[PDB]
Symmetry: D2
Subunit: 256 residues, 4 copies
């Protein structure tokens, strides 16, 4: 075990930067390698078994880079590839399904929103009983176009969330992009606790890695970005979501 | 040589069924092979050179199936791969850029809307001078989510089309999906001629094929669908856009 | 852990059946999944980093089949991928480099023959000091053509082995195919102990698995053959190497 | 339309340099792009349909470099991909099957040797009636090992050609490597005319391009080497075959 090594984080694109930010806030001295599979984004409308294979090849790439842990920041890739990926690999592997499902278990009536793949996967029912679950495809592009505070967002939120139970006490924001929409989602579902995948996973990663002696108290915190599509396109989209991307390199889908 | 052979049509997914529909209306006796690359949809956010390689791959597949002609129904793939693909192949090859650019030449001030790849490609400026061009990313998912006639669509159209020159005379709808949004776009850009890629291309294909003796006079029209992703997922989405998919099978990306 | 689960064995092709046969002789109750990557055979002239990525891909596939252990039967893939693959994965992972290198440390002067990739990798020197190493490219095709008892095999053996040091005590047969050449190689190097990768690895697998409590004490083993190329071509070539392939199916490289 | 443009030549690897050398002898003014698919060599043991797909990929790549003509120097890839590749493409496309098969039609009894894929393909029989056909797998690695003039070459030739009909008049050397084995083949098959693919194809290319007005009358053409595997490995194999390669670039299989 080498605490000097980086933590790998991966997602289909820029959305997983919500998970990276939450991690960096808790672990300001860790080195992160953030991998965005922008050549094959989005994952949410692909076959779950195809996404599972993507996760395997990206995990191997991150292990060849020397990481001491892997975070699956994507809710679709977590749904497709966990728990098995964590069972199959020696390094600690963390995803974004279990921590929010665990928190959800302290409510009686729980909902899930996410991509098509995520809601159809059955991943969340493995860990928490769900009263209601709804795929919300337009949420991701609405966020990537910068419109989370626009009334279009409130109108789209109404279109997806109107028919949710009056019962609901909690809603899992089971997609990387949904923290940007807490405003609109909350306006449409007053009272309902909103469970943020990034914050609850960041907490679990920081806890578990401390527990195992894998953190580096002497480190200088920094992030390197690796993408499969065009680096400048990524950097521009990341800036629209409020992330300054300093170092980015394109990784060949051949290197996988 | 063989007018009994099918016409190949390809796109990234279901959006190109607007081109298929316009073609079938003008050529009800032809056999069509419609190829939707749903494993790698969408193309609009990919590198143009990557889309160009996809098109080469899919054209080869269609030629091995025995097609007598190829229609690139996708505006992004047309932008990436034409005119070179038509120069490189013996069979007649048609796209959705040139016919609408041609029609646009009968106007003094022309606009273009499309995907990021399409507007940034410069494909359209090669055939027609443009006063204004604008990438409209949210239009595709808005259409696939069935919302093209809802208030949200008018608001999204306003968001993208507000800064359009007051003196525009025509707008190229340079994306497979955008014929669904004529109401919302017209309401926001009253007075502007909206040029439909599907109908103008289907007109050109029917003309050129008759002119070369490649139409099948006495055939019984039908369509076979080929997709690289899940066939049932595709059949469901095609119905949401008003196409009844009867015969579909999955083509392995290894088959390419 | 479940001892009724199969053991995964993988190679580039038919050569690895030498390892499967030895394994099955020692472990007649175990179920084996033998994976032959015949779409991409041979490995010996490919870049080591490319073979390393193949190994990762195939290990993931085997893990998705539920194996309780993995044997890398190929000396080229072992050289490319081990020890890291065993460090990175939770199931026991065995290769064909370490057991013979271990046996070799009981001799003063040790040689190695194998593919180009194997001899240039430096995998064997990590475990045993070598006096002489030679790549022998024609050996593999000689075996696959069934000529190991022909005089051409003696002449080719001489071509490769004549300049070996006359004080050599042991020779590592560092390639799946080379047990078929024991006669010829022994003729040309009388008195040199020939260390056979299949037998020594099988011994280690049986040893290690018993110590872990992972062997199945009841029931009767079977073999399932999985190849990435044409199954009838594989069956024909295996028959020449003396294996009667019962169950074989083609796995798509897209399943990988 | 531009005779300064290069001529593309492709093969699985170094074997095709026999075709390149014959071309350059006849056409000292032409620029050549020689493409060696060393990442995926050899083709002779792969499914024909797989090789056909490789040929399509590499052809598109060469068209993106601006070639004015394509020569398929590989007999296996010619067998897999022609004549359809020539029919499907606008630029002149030449292979190594037809010219030797044409020359063979001036003989009563004709045999064929080549790879497994070539012999199984039935490519030659569509152009010339064959009395005998035999796959000769060991010939390629024998040549690449530099053993073509040695006694072992004679014995391998005897092993393959022994059962050849005594009344043969001509034998098609249907593989890139076989010109190196004329000595051993002719010693075993005295009195049989040996038809050389490289010389008969280069002859046809020069004739056809001249008649088409595509030759550059003022050129001082160079050769560029492009390979999908490791350039240095390629350079060293070429040297074993008597070609000094200087300018070689690695082309990613992802560029295809
Ligand atoms: N990252 C995905 C959203 C975007 C995608 O579909 O790839 C998720 O968390 O579900
Ligand atoms: N068919 C594409 C739209 C969907 C995509 O981005 O692939 C186009 O016409 O531009
Ligand atoms: N299995 C390989 C030999 C055949 C190949 O080169 O793939 C090895 O043992 O090195
Ligand atoms: N170039 C091949 C021989 C090497 C290979 O099998 O790829 C041929 O002419 O058939
Ligand atoms: Cl995949
Ligand atoms: Cl979705
Ligand atoms: Cl777009
Ligand atoms: Cl104009
Ligand atoms: Cl609305
Ligand atoms: Cl080798
Ligand atoms: Cl062969
Ligand atoms: Cl050169």
């Amino acid at each position: 075990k080498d605490p000097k090594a980086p933590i790998g984080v991966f997602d289909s694109g820029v959305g997983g930067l919500t998970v990276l930010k939450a991690l960096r806030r808790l672990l300001p001295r860790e080195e992160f390698l953030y991998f965005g599979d922008t050549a094959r984004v989005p994952y949410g409308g692909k076959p779950l078994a195809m996404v599972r294979r993507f996760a395997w090849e990206i995990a191997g790439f991150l292990l060849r880079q020397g990481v001491k842990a892997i975070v699956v920041a994507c809710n679709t890739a977590s749904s497709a590839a966990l728990p098995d990926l964590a069972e199959d690999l020696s390094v600690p592997v963390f995803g974004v399904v279990e921590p929010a499902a665990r928190a959800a278990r302290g409510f009686r009536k729980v909902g899930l929103i996410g991509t098509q793949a995520t809601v159809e996967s059955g991943a969340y029912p493995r860990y928490v009983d769900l009263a209601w679950a709804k795929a919300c495809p337009l949420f991701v592009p609405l966020v990537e176009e910068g419109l989370w505070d626009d009334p279009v967002a409130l109108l789209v939120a109404r279109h997806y969330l109107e028919d949710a139970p009056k019962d609901l006490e909690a809603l899992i924001l089971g997609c990387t992009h949904y923290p940007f929409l807490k405003g609109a989602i909350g306006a449409v579902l007053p009272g309902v606790a909103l469970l943020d995948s990034a914050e609850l996973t960041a907490q679990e990663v920081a806890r578990a890695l401390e527990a195992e002696g894998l953190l580096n108290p002497e480190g200088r915190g920094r992030t390197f970005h690796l993408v499969t599509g065009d680096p400048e396109a990524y950097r521009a989209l990341a800036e629209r979501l409020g992330e300054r991307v300093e170092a980015v390199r394109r990784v060949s889908l051949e290197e996988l």
